[PDB]
Design an enzyme around this catalytic site. Structure first.
Site, mmCIF file in Angstrom:
data_model
loop_
_atom_site.group_PDB
_atom_site.id
_atom_site.type_symbol
_atom_site.label_atom_id
_atom_site.label_comp_id
_atom_site.label_asym_id
_atom_site.label_seq_id
_atom_site.Cartn_x
_atom_site.Cartn_y
_atom_site.Cartn_z
ATOM 1 N N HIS A 131 -3.461 -10.221 -5.466
ATOM 2 C CA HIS A 131 -4.320 -10.995 -6.361
ATOM 3 C C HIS A 131 -3.525 -11.819 -7.329
ATOM 4 O O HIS A 131 -4.028 -12.693 -8.010
ATOM 5 C CB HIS A 131 -5.512 -10.215 -6.890
ATOM 6 C CG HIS A 131 -6.633 -10.204 -5.860
ATOM 7 N ND1 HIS A 131 -7.750 -9.413 -5.928
ATOM 8 C CD2 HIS A 131 -6.766 -10.927 -4.719
ATOM 9 C CE1 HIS A 131 -8.534 -9.633 -4.892
ATOM 10 N NE2 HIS A 131 -7.955 -10.540 -4.139
ATOM 11 N N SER A 135 -3.897 -16.507 -1.166
ATOM 12 C CA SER A 135 -3.792 -16.331 0.319
ATOM 13 C C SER A 135 -2.925 -17.500 0.719
ATOM 14 O O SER A 135 -2.740 -18.429 -0.072
ATOM 15 C CB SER A 135 -5.220 -16.435 0.817
ATOM 16 O OG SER A 135 -5.806 -15.129 0.852
HETATM 17 C C1 HEM Z 1 -6.141 -0.188 5.420
HETATM 18 C C2 HEM Z 1 -5.609 -1.268 5.957
HETATM 19 C C3 HEM Z 1 -5.739 -2.646 5.291
HETATM 20 C C4 HEM Z 1 -6.668 -3.116 4.481
HETATM 21 C C5 HEM Z 1 -7.903 -2.356 3.974
HETATM 22 C C6 HEM Z 1 -6.326 -4.484 4.142
HETATM 23 C C7 HEM Z 1 -7.033 -5.333 3.323
HETATM 24 C C8 HEM Z 1 -6.706 -6.657 3.076
HETATM 25 C C9 HEM Z 1 -7.600 -7.634 2.499
HETATM 26 C C10 HEM Z 1 -9.042 -7.330 2.079
HETATM 27 C C11 HEM Z 1 -6.947 -8.784 2.451
HETATM 28 C C12 HEM Z 1 -7.463 -10.109 1.863
HETATM 29 C C13 HEM Z 1 -8.070 -10.980 2.990
HETATM 30 C C14 HEM Z 1 -7.001 -11.368 3.988
HETATM 31 O O1 HEM Z 1 -5.920 -11.778 3.504
HETATM 32 O O2 HEM Z 1 -7.267 -11.226 5.194
HETATM 33 C C15 HEM Z 1 -5.595 -8.574 2.936
HETATM 34 C C16 HEM Z 1 -4.534 -9.464 3.050
HETATM 35 C C17 HEM Z 1 -3.272 -9.237 3.507
HETATM 36 N N1 HEM Z 1 -2.877 -8.064 4.137
HETATM 37 FE FE1 HEM Z 1 -3.952 -6.400 4.317
HETATM 38 N N2 HEM Z 1 -5.144 -4.845 4.778
HETATM 39 C C18 HEM Z 1 -4.770 -3.719 5.495
HETATM 40 C C19 HEM Z 1 -3.664 -3.610 6.296
HETATM 41 C C20 HEM Z 1 -2.623 -4.461 6.220
HETATM 42 C C21 HEM Z 1 -1.397 -4.330 6.983
HETATM 43 C C22 HEM Z 1 -1.103 -3.213 7.999
HETATM 44 C C23 HEM Z 1 -0.615 -5.349 6.629
HETATM 45 C C24 HEM Z 1 0.782 -5.676 7.136
HETATM 46 C C25 HEM Z 1 1.448 -4.668 7.614
HETATM 47 C C26 HEM Z 1 -1.285 -6.160 5.644
HETATM 48 C C27 HEM Z 1 -0.765 -7.280 5.079
HETATM 49 C C28 HEM Z 1 -1.526 -8.203 4.450
HETATM 50 C C29 HEM Z 1 -1.047 -9.487 3.996
HETATM 51 C C30 HEM Z 1 0.383 -10.015 4.156
HETATM 52 C C31 HEM Z 1 -2.108 -10.064 3.428
HETATM 53 C C32 HEM Z 1 -2.179 -11.456 2.785
HETATM 54 C C33 HEM Z 1 -1.899 -12.681 3.640
HETATM 55 C C34 HEM Z 1 -2.459 -13.915 2.971
HETATM 56 O O3 HEM Z 1 -3.706 -13.891 2.867
HETATM 57 O O4 HEM Z 1 -1.624 -14.771 2.605
HETATM 58 N N3 HEM Z 1 -2.521 -5.592 5.414
HETATM 59 N N4 HEM Z 1 -5.476 -7.243 3.342
#
Ligand code: HEM
Ligand code: HEC
Ligand code: HEM
Lengths: 62, 64, 379, 49, 22, 106, 241, 81
Positions: C201, C205
Site C-alpha cells: 500500500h 500496483s
Molecule cells: C495468501 C496468498 C496471497 C494473497 C491473499 C495475496 C493478496 C494480494 C492482493 C489482494 C494483491 C493486490 C491486487 C494484485 O496486485 O493482484 C496482491 C498483490 C501482489 N502480490 Fe499477493 N497475494 C498472495 C500471494 C502472493 C504470492 C505467493 C506472491 C509472490 C510470491 C505475491 C506477490 C504479490 C505482488 C508482487 C503483488 C503486487 C504486484 C503489483 O500489483 O504491482 N502474492 N496480493
C-alpha cells in the site's frame, strides 16, 4: 406520450432507495419461486420416469 | 442373451477381422519350448479393445 | 473534518484502502487474482470450520467422519467438495498471481514479494496437511513419503522425521497434529496476507506498460470494486462448475480407500499443485540432492529480484523475455505431466531435461536475454 | 486562446435517446436512468437468491 | 421529516426480508 | 574493424525496436526505463518541455494500455528518431554517484 | 508391468451433465447386490435408506430391512437379543471381521462396495467391464484355480468366482436377467452408493448454470456502466510552448 | 503521505469525459473486438503459442514411446532366437 416501461418503473420504484430496496426484497421472493418452479420442471422433464417422483406408483398403497 | 450376440457382430467388422489375424497366429504360432514370455496376452488385448468399443454403443440400446 | 464517516473512526479510515486508494487505470485482468486469492482464503476458512464442525481426528474415524460428512449431514456434501475443489482454485489462482509477478516484474517490490513467497510456502504447508485429514490411502502414503524425504538430512534428519510424526510411523499422533496445524495455519496466514497488503500500500500496483501510472490514477471504489465482484463471479463459476458437475475430476486421486499401512500406491503423487516439485525431485539419483533441489525449485523465487538484468521492469516490451517466460510456463506444464507418470525411462529422461530447463530458464537463460535486449535497444 | 477549444465528437459513444444535437435530453433520460438501475435491481435480486 | 416516510419504507424492507429470508 | 558487422546490427536493432511494441503505443525508449533512484533524479532535471512531454506520452500510452488499442500506423514512433533525451541527464546522475561511491573507499 | 485394458467408456443413462440416475436400475441393482454380492462384500456406509433414494417405501424397506436383521441381525453386530424392526442398522457384514473374510476367500479381502465406483480408478465403466469381462487365458499361460483370468485386472488376474451369470436372480417386474443386463443394474446401484448426492448435485448444477447465465451478463453490464466514463474518455494536450 | 494530491505534477493536459447514462456500455460489441481480438492474438500467437506446441509434440512422442517400449514387450529383444 407515455414513459418508456423503464421510466415508469423508474419514477415509481427506483427514485427513493427505500422503494428500491423494498422492490428488491419482494422480487427476490417472487423470483426465487418462479425460478425454482421453472428450473425444477425443466430438470425433471430431462429425466422422465428416472426419478422416484415419477416412480412412487409401483409400491404405493397397493 | 443380449450381451453375447452384440459381441460377435462387433468382431465382424473389417477392423475386427483385420486385427484378429495377430491373435490367430500367436494362438498357435508358439514353438516347442513354449517360452512362457511368449504369453499371447498383448495380441488378445488388442482384439478385445476393438471388440468392446463397438459393443458398448450397440449393446446399450438392447437392455432395460 | 466533521461527520466524514471514513476519517471519524480511525478504524474506518484504515478501510479506505479499498475505496479512495489510487489504482492504475491500465491493468490486465491478471490483477484480480490477488483479490480472488483472498476470497479463496476466506472461502476455505468458512467451509473448513464447517467441515471441522463434524470431523474427527482419529485413525478409526477420520475416513468415517469424512464419509459421514458427505452422507448424513445436511449439505455436508457440497461443503466438503466445495472445500476440496476450493483448494484447487486457491492454487490455480496462486500460480496466476505469481506468473504476473514474474512477467511484469512486480517483484521489484522487494519486500512485498518476499512476503508473497512466505505466503505461497504457507499455503503449501496447509494443503499438504489437510489432504492428510481424511486418512485415505493416497493421503497416508504421501504423508509418509514426503516427511521421510526430510530424513535425507545427515545428522539430524532421522531424529527429526520422528519428532514431526510423533512416533515411528504415521498413526494417531501424526494425524491429530495435522488437524491442529491445518486449523491455525490459515489464521496465521491471514495476518501475513494483511502484512502483505500493508507493504504494497506504500507503492501501488505496477502495470502492463511497466511505467509509473501516477499521472494516470483512478479511485478504487467506482471501478475496481465492480471488476473484483465480476472476477469473483467468474471465480465462483469455475469452482461450482467443478464442484457440481465434475466433483473429483480435478481431484486426481480416486483413493477413497481407507489407508492400509501395508499397500501399494501404484503411482503415488501429490495433487497437481505439487507435481512440479515432485518431478523436480525424482530427476536426482541421490535423495538429499533431490530434497535440496526440491527446496530450491520453490525458494528460487526469493532470488528473482537479484536475477533481474533489464532496464525495463516490464517484460511487455521485451520479446525474447516473453518467449522464454512462456517456455518455462510450458516447461512447468511438462513437469506437472511427469508428476503422474510411472517411474520409467521415457519419463525419467524427459523429466531430467525439464528440470535442467527449469533452472536454466530462471537461472541463466532469462538473465542473458535481459542484457541482450538491453544492448539491442542501445540502453 | 482557451476559446479555440472544442469538445470532441461523442456521437459514436452516446446513444439513441440522447443523440439529438438540437433537442432536450431531460424528457429522454428519465428512462435511461431506469434501464441502468433496472439492471442493477435485477443483479441484486438474483444474487440475493 | 422525510425520515418517517423513509423510516417507514426501511421498516417495511426489514420486515419482508425477515419474513421471506427467514 | 566493424564495417560489415556493426552496420548490420542496425538491422536487428531496427527489427527489434518495432518488435517491442512500445513503438506502437506512442512511447519512446527513454520513457520505458525502470524508474529507480538514478532515473528519478535524472527525470527531475528535465526542463519543462522535455518533462511535460514524457508525462503526456505516458498519459497517452497508459491510456491505450487500458483500452487495449494500438495507435494508428500514421502516428508511431520511428526508430530513426531516437530522442535519448534522458540519456544526457541520466549519465551525469550516474557519473556523480560513481564518483561519490569512489570518494568513499579511503 | 502388464498393460491394463482400462480404457472403457461405457455408454450410460447418467453420462450427461443433466442426466440423472434411473432408480428402477438402482432398485434392480440393489437386489443384485443383496442376493449375488452381500455374501462376501460389505457396504458399511450403506444404511437401509433407499426409501426415497431407491423408490422403496419406508414400509417397503422397513420390511426389507427387518428380515435382513432377522437372519443376519444384530447378533453379528453384538445385539445379543436383537431381531426384526430397526432402520438405523447398516448393511450386514458378510463376516465378523476382515481376517475371517480373507479366509473364506483364501487370502483375498472382498472390497467394501460402498465406494468401489468412486474408489478404484475408472469408475462404473471398469466395474461393468470387469464383471462382464471374462475371457480365455492366453496361449502359454498358467493359472492357479483361484487366479481366474480377467482381461481388465491390473496384474492380469483376480480371485473372482462367477461374479454374475445368466438367471442368477429374478426381479419383481420381470426384467430380463442377462449377465450384462444384471451388471448394468448392478453398476448403477453402485454408482449411487458411491455418490448418493449424484442427483441433487446435477439438479443444482442446472440452477447454478441458469442463474450464472443471468448474473454474468448483468454484472458485465454494471462493469461497463461505470467504466464507460474512462473508456469513452478523450485527451488533449495544449502546452503554452 | 496523502495519495491523491501528492502523486506527481502534470501541466497542460486537458481530458474530456461523459457520463455513463448518456453513453452506451457496449458500442461495437463485436465489430471492435473481432479485429482487436484478432490483431493482438496475432501478435501474441508467435510469442506465446510455440512452447505449448512443443510441449504437445513431446507429450505425443513421449507417450508413444512408453506404450511401445512397454507394450512392445518383445521390443527390447525379439522372440525367435
Ligand atoms: C495468501 C496468498 C496471497 C494473497 C491473499 C495475496 C493478496 C494480494 C492482493 C489482494 C494483491 C493486490 C491486487 C494484485 O496486485 O493482484 C496482491 C498483490 C501482489 N502480490 Fe499477493 N497475494 C498472495 C500471494 C502472493 C504470492 C505467493 C506472491 C509472490 C510470491 C505475491 C506477490 C504479490 C505482488 C508482487 C503483488 C503486487 C504486484 C503489483 O500489483 O504491482 N502474492 N496480493
Ligand atoms: C465372493 C465370492 C464374491 C462375490 C459374490 C463378489 N466378489 Fe468381488 N471380489 C471377490 C474377491 C475375493 C476379490 C479380490 C480379488 C483380488 O484381490 O485379486 C474381489 C474383487 C473385486 C473387484 C476388483 C477390484 C480390484 O481389486 O481392482 C471388484 C471391482 C469387485 N470385486 C466387485 C464386485 C461386485 C460389483 C460384485 C457383485 C456383482 C462382486 N464383486 C461379487 C469376491 C467376490
Ligand atoms: C486456508 C488454507 C486451506 C487450504 C489450502 C485447505 C485445503 C484443504 C484440503 C486440500 C483438504 C483435503 C480434503 C479432501 O481432499 O478430502 C482439506 C480438508 C480439511 N480442512 Fe482445509 N484448507 C484450508 C483451510 C482450512 C481451515 C481454515 C480450516 C478450519 C479452520 C480447515 C479445515 C479442514 C478440515 C477439518 C478438513 C478435513 C475434512 C475434509 O477432508 O474435508 N481447512 N483442506
Amino acid at each position: 406520450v407515455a414513459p418508456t416501461l423503464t421510466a415508469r418503473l423508474y419514477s415509481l420504484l427506483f427514485r427513493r432507495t427505500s422503494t428500491f430496496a423494498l422492490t428488491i426484497v419482494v422480487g427476490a421472493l417472487f423470483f426465487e419461486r418462479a425460478f425454482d418452479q421453472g428450473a425444477d420442471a425443466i430438470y425433471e422433464h430431462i429425466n422422465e420416469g428416472k426419478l422416484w417422483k415419477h416412480i412412487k406408483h409401483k409400491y404405493e398403497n397397493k | 442373451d443380449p450381451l453375447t450376440t452384440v459381441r460377435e457382430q462387433c468382431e465382424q467388422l473389417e477392423k475386427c477381422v483385420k486385427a484378429r489375424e495377430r491373435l490367430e497366429l500367436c494362438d498357435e504360432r508358439v514353438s516347442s519350448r513354449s517360452q512362457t514370455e511368449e504369453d499371447c496376452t498383448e495380441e488378445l488385448l488388442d482384439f478385445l479393445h476393438a471388440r468392446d468399443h463397438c459393443v458398448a454403443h450397440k449393446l446399450f440400446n438392447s437392455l432395460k | 473534518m466533521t461527520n466524514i464517516r471514513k476519517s471519524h473512526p480511525l478504524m474506518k479510515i484504515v478501510n479506505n484502502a479499498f475505496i479512495d486508494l489510487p489504482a492504475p487505470s491500465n491493468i490486465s485482468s491478471w490483477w484480480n487474482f490477488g483479490s480472488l486469492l483472498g476470497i479463496c482464503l476466506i472461502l476455505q476458512i468458512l467451509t473448513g470450520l464447517f467441515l471441522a464442525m463434524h470431523y474427527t481426528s482419529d485413525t478409526t474415524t477420520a475416513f468415517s467422519s469424512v464419509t459421514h460428512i458427505c452422507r448424513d449431514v445436511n449439505y455436508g456434501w457440497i461443503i466438503r467438495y466445495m472445500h476440496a475443489n476450493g483448494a484447487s482454485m486457491f492454487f490455480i489462482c496462486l500460480y496466476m498471481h505469481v506468473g504476473r509477478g514474474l512477467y511484469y516484474g512486480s517483484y521489484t517490490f522487494l519486500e512485498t514479494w518476499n512476503i508473497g513467497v512466505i505466503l505461497l510456502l504457507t499455503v503449501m504447508a496447509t494443503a499438504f496437511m489437510g489432504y492428510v485429514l481424511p486418512w485415505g490411502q493416497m493421503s497416508f502414503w504421501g504423508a509418509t513419503v514426503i516427511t521421510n524425504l526430510l530424513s535425507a538430512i545427515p545428522y539430524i534428519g532421522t531424529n527429526l522425521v520422528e519428532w514431526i510424526w510423533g512416533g515411528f510411523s504415521v498413526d494417531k499422533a501424526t494425524l491429530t497434529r495435522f488437524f491442529a496445524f491445518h486449523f491455525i495455519l490459515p489464521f496465521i496466514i491471514m495476518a501475513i496476507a494483511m502484512v502483505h497488503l500493508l507493504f504494497l500500500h506504500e507503492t501501488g500496483s505496477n502495470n502492463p506498460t511497466g511505467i509509473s501510472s501516477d499521472v494516470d490514477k483512478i479511485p478504487f471504489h467506482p471501478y475496481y470494486t465492480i471488476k473484483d465482484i465480476l472476477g469473483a463471479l467468474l471465480l465462483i463459476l469455475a469452482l461450482m462448475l467443478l464442484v457440481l458437475f465434475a466433483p473429483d475430476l480435478l481431484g486426481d486421486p480416486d483413493n477413497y480407500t481407507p489407508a492400509n499401512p501395508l499397500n501399494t500406491p501404484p503411482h503415488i503423487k501429490p495433487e497437481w499443485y505439487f507435481l512440479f516439485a515432485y518431478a523436480i525431485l525424482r530427476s536426482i539419483p541421490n535423495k538429499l540432492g533431490g530434497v535440496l533441489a526440491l527446496a530450491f525449485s520453490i525458494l528460487i523465487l526469493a532470488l528473482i529480484p537479484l536475477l533481474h538484468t533489464s532496464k525495463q521492469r516490464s517484460m511487455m516490451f521485451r520479446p525474447l523475455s516473453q518467449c522464454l517466460f512462456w517456455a518455462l510456463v510450458a516447461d512447468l506444464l511438462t513437469l506437472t505431466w511427469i508428476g503422474g507418470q510411472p517411474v520409467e525411462h521415457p519419463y525419467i529422461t524427459i523429466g531430467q531435461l525439464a528440470s535442467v530447463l527449469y533452472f536454466l530458464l530462471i537461472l541463466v537463460l532469462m538473465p542473458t536475454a535481459g542484457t541482450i535486449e538491453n544492448k539491442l535497444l542501445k540502453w | 486562446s482557451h476559446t479555440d477549444i472544442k469538445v470532441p465528437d461523442f456521437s459514436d459513444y452516446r446513444r439513441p435517446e440522447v443523440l439529438d444535437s438540437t433537442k432536450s435530453s431531460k424528457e429522454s433520460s428519465e428512462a435511461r436512468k431506469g434501464f441502468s438501475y433496472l439492471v442493477t435491481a435485477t443483479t441484486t435480486v438474483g444474487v440475493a437468491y | 421529516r422525510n425520515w418517517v416516510p423513509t423510516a417507514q419504507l426501511w421498516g417495511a424492507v426489514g420486515a419482508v426480508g425477515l419474513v421471506s429470508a427467514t | 574493424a566493424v564495417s560489415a558487422s556493426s552496420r548490420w546490427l542496425e538491422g536487428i536493432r531496427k527489427w527489434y525496436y518495432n518488435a517491442a511494441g512500445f513503438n506502437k503505443l506512442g512511447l519512446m525508449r527513454d520513457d520505458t526505463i525502470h524508474e529507480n533512484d538514478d532515473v528519478k533524479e535524472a527525470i527531475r532535471r528535465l526542463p519543462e518541455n522535455l518533462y511535460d512531454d514524457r508525462v503526456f506520452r505516458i498519459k497517452r500510452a497508459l491510456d491505450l494500455s487500458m483500452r487495449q488499442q494500438i495507435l494508428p500506423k500514421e502516428q508511431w514512433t520511428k526508430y530513426e528518431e531516437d530522442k535519448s533525451y534522458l540519456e544526457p541527464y541520466l549519465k551525469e546522475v550516474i557519473r556523480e554517484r560513481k564518483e561519490r561511491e569512489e570518494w568513499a573507499k579511503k | 508391468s502388464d498393460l491394463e485394458l482400462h480404457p472403457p467408456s461405457y455408454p450410460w443413462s447418467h453420462r450427461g451433465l443433466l442426466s440423472s440416475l434411473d432408480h428402477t436400475s438402482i432398485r434392480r441393482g440393489f437386489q443384485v447386490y443383496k442376493q449375488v454380492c452381500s455374501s462376501c462384500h460389505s457396504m458399511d456406509y450403506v444404511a437401509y435408506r433407499h426409501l426415497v433414494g431407491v423408490c422403496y417405501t419406508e414400509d417397503e424397506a422397513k420390511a426389507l430391512a427387518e428380515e435382513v436383521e432377522v437372519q443376519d441381525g444384530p447378533n453379528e453386530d453384538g445385539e445379543m437379543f436383537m431381531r426384526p424392526g430397526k432402520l438405523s442398522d447398516y448393511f450386514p457384514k458378510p463376516y465378523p471381521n476382515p481376517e475371517a473374510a480373507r479366509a473364506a476367500n483364501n487370502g483375498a479381502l472382498p472390497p467394501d462396495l460402498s465406494y468401489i465406483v468412486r474408489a478404484r480408478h475408472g469408475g462404473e465403466d471398469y466395474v461393468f467391464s470387469l464383471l462382464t469381462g471374462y475371457c480365455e487365458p492366453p496361449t502359454g499361460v498358467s493359472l492357479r484355480e483361484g487366479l481366474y483370468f480377467n482381461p481388465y485386472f491390473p496384474g492380469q488376474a483376480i480371485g473372482m468366482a462367477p461374479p454374475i451369470y445368466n438367471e442368477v436372480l429374478e426381479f419383481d417386474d420381470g426384467t430380463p436377467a442377462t449377465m450384462s443386463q444384471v451388471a448394468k443394474d448392478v453398476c448403477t446401484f453402485l454408482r449411487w452408493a458411491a455418490e448418493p448426492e449424484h442427483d441433487h448435485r446435477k439438479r443444482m448444477g442446472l440452477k447454478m448454470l441458469l442463474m450464472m447465465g443471468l448474473l454474468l451478463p448483468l454484472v458485465y453490464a454494471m462493469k461497463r456502466h461505470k467504466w464507460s466514463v474512462l473508456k469513452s474518455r478523450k485527451l488533449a494536450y495544449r502546452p503554452p510552448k | 503521505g496523502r495519495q491523491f494530491g501528492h502523486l506527481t505534477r502534470v501541466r497542460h493536459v486537458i481530458t474530456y469525459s461523459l457520463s455513463p447514462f448518456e453513453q452506451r456500455a457496449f458500442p461495437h460489441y463485436f465489430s471492435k473486438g473481432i479485429p482487436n481480438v484478432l490483431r493482438r492474438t496475432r501478435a501474441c500467437i508467435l510469442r506465446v503459442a510455440p512452447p505449448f506446441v512443443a510441449f504437445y509434440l513431446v507429450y505425443t512422442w513421449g507417450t508413444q514411446e512408453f506404450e511401445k517400449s512397454k507394450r512392445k514387450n518383445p521390443a527390447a529383444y525379439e522372440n525367435d532366437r
